[PDB]
Design a protein around this ligand. Structure first.
Ligand SMILES: NC(=O)c1ccc[n+]([C@@H]2O[C@H](COP(=O)([O-])OP(=O)(O)OC[C@H]3O[C@@H](n4cnc5c(N)ncnc54)[C@H](OP(=O)(O)O)[C@@H]3O)[C@@H](O)[C@H]2O)c1
Ligand SMILES: O=C(O)COc1cc(F)ccc1C(=O)NCc1cccc([N+](=O)[O-])c1
Length: 316
């Protein structure tokens, strides 16, 4: 299938990107270099991942080598929760730009709808372990994101982990200047997200699926959790197509008109994961994979469940 999807800012976004959460700083430079060498043109980053400097070393070296041109890359980062304040957004974006070695981002996302108290800690806590909120609302944070477009720092802005009512709040914002281009959400066969995806797509917002392999390296994994990569039903579909389970899990969101961002630091897997443009899942395969939904989430924190903007109390 076609490699890029058209966004509502008029730019094209590669439907396959490389994830970088948990990629160790001593491995991620080589991972990104390999990824670019084997065809990746989209890298998903974030300040909170603590490895943007090292991602940037790889990007800058592949630009210097003229393996790629800057206009052929699609670099995404995200505004962390402790920077939702009007006066902090530009500096947060600039720190990311400096670290990534870039003079603009292709896409900058509000990482989570929950704003936290600014400071050095990424998760400021009270003495009982609840996150300490900011009083800055999502609409004022969105206005600050719009400024970044108007200053040339970012080509597109979007959101991540927003539920449909939160997306709707953005879309209904008085004086809205730029619609979100993307909502980046968790999505895989155990969390299929039909309702939220349909809503976003109906509004022209492109959905990016994160943790498409079920994030087997997530730090809070428990032995009893379900495992996509080991699910015999998914392995069977992969065997029928002579592809790996990971390749099926990556192709699945692609055929739903989603962008997908599998993470790896393993060179062989980085290359394997890109070899997904040359086979098709049938409609029956797609519906079968959708049938595995169990509303199982990788990402979501106990410490945030009383924040006024916690996204996962709503059904979708
Ligand atoms: N917006 C958000 O709030 C948010 C939240 C979560 C994730 N994300 C983004 O989405 C990206 C992907 O999600 P994720 O990192 O949670 O997990 P994931 O991509 O679902 O899974 C990554 C894990 O799968 C392994 N893996 C990769 N390719 C494989 C293959 N072909 N065969 C077997 N195992 C394979 C990786 O191992 P190795 O690396 O050891 O090869 C790693 O342990 C993140 O890195 C981040 O960029 C965003
Ligand atoms: O948020 C991501 O992209 C992946 O997960 C993390 C990555 C990090 F580097 C550090 C922490 C997380 C993490 O716990 N992320 C989960 C998370 C964050 C913020 C708010 C909530 N919430 O439920 O409202 C959940």
């Amino acid at each position: 299938m076609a490699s890029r999807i058209l966004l509502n800012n008029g730019a094209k976004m590669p439907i396959l990107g490389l994830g970088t959460w948990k990629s160790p700083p001593g491995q991620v430079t080589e991972a990104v270099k390999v990824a670019i060498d084997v065809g990746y043109r989209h890298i998903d980053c974030a300040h909170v991942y603590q490895n943007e400097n090292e991602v940037g070393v790889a990007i800058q070296e592949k630009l210097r080598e003229q393996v790629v041109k800057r206009e052929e890359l699609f670099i995404v980062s995200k505004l962390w929760c402790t920077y939702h304040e009007k006066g902090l957004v530009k500096g947060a974006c600039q720190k990311t730009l400096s670290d990534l070695k870039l003079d603009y981002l292709d896409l900058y996302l509000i990482h989570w709808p929950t704003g936290f108290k600014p400071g050095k800690e990424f998760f400021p806590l009270d003495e009982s372990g609840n996150v300490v909120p900011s009083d800055t609302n999502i609409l004022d944070t969105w206005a600050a994101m719009e400024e970044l477009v108007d200053e040339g720092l970012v080509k597109a802005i979007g959101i991540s982990n927003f539920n449909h009512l939160q997306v709707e709040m953005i879309l209904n914002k008085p004086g809205l200047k730029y619609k979100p281009a993307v909502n980046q959400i968790e999505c895989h066969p155990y969390l299929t997200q039909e309702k939220l995806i349909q809503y976003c797509q109906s509004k022209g917002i492109v959905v990016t699926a994160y943790s498409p392999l079920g994030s087997p390296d997530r730090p809070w994994a428990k032995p009893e959790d379900p495992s996509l990569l080991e699910d015999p039903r998914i392995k069977a579909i992969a065997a029928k197509h002579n592809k790996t389970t990971a390749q099926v899990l990556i192709r699945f969101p692609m055929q739903r008109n989603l962008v997908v961002i599998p993470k790896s630091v393993t060179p062989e897997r980085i290359a394997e994961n890109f070899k997904v443009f040359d086979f098709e899942l049938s409609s029956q395969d797609m519906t079968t994979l959708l049938s595995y939904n169990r509303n199982w989430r990788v990402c979501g924190l106990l410490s945030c469940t009383s924040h006024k903007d916690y996204p996962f109390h709503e059904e979708f």
